[PDB]
Structures are given as C-alpha cells and as structure tokens.
Design a protein around this ligand. Structure first.
Ligand SMILES: [Cu+2]
Length: 128
C-alpha cells in the first residue's frame, strides 16, 4: 500500500484534509506539506505536527509560547510524535517518520501550532 500523503495549508488557515489514514503495513510514512498562499511565514506560517489526541492542547499551548524561532514548538517536547518544519507562502517541507510510533487503535491528531491556527487547522490520523 502507499505510505505518503500530500497536504496544503493556505492563507485562509485551512488544511486540505482533516483525516489521514496510515496503512497498517507501512513501516514509514511521509508527509509532504506545501503552502499555496501568498502570506509570509511570520504571519501565516504552517507546520504539520502529530501527537496523541490528549497531548494536542499541551503541545499547541507550549508551542505558541516558544516563538517563531523555535517553529512554535517547545524544545525537546516528547509529546510530539513527528512534525514538519514551519513554512510560509511558496515553501514546502517533507518529513518521514517511523510507523512504529503509531499503535493500532490509538487516537492521534495533526495540527498547526502557529498562534491561533490549531482550532481551524487540525485533523485525525489513524492506522488502518
Ligand atoms: Cu498554520
């Protein structure tokens, strides 16, 4: 089965998906994030950040506090399972992580940790 997904975040604070499925036979999974908007990183930056559903609020809250130079993530935040870098208009970033980090049946959320974005830019990730 395929083990990648392409995702976009725009100037309207939208991701173009709110549900990601990772096939259970994948050993790695790749997220290709792009920003088709016109606004720069420092006002409309987007990352793709993955945690358990329960950890999302904490990661987002400490993330906002950490500032732009830390990609809006608290340093050494063990709650973050995987994440792209933060990007603005016309940029793209890819990450590849181990599916060994994703247990069957557990509930995961992906979201942007740029200030104010997460309520609008979030979705589920599940293994199937
Ligand atoms: Cu964002």
């Amino acid at each position: 089965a395929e083990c990648s997904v392409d995702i976009q975040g725009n100037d309207q604070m939208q991701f173009n998906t709110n549900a990601i499925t990772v096939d259970k036979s994948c050993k790695q999974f790749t997220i290709n994030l792009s920003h088709p908007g016109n606004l720069p990183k420092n006002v409309m930056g987007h990352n793709w950040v993955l945690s358990t559903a329960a950890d999302m609020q904490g990661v987002v809250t400490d993330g906002m506090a950490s500032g732009l130079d830390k990609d809006y993530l608290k340093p050494d935040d063990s709650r973050v399972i995987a994440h792209t870098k933060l990007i603005g208009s016309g940029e793209k970033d890819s990450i590849t992580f181990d599916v060994s980090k994703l247990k069957e049946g557990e509930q995961y959320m992906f979201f942007c940790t740029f200030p104010g974005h997460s309520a609008l830019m979030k979705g589920t990730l599940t293994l199937k």
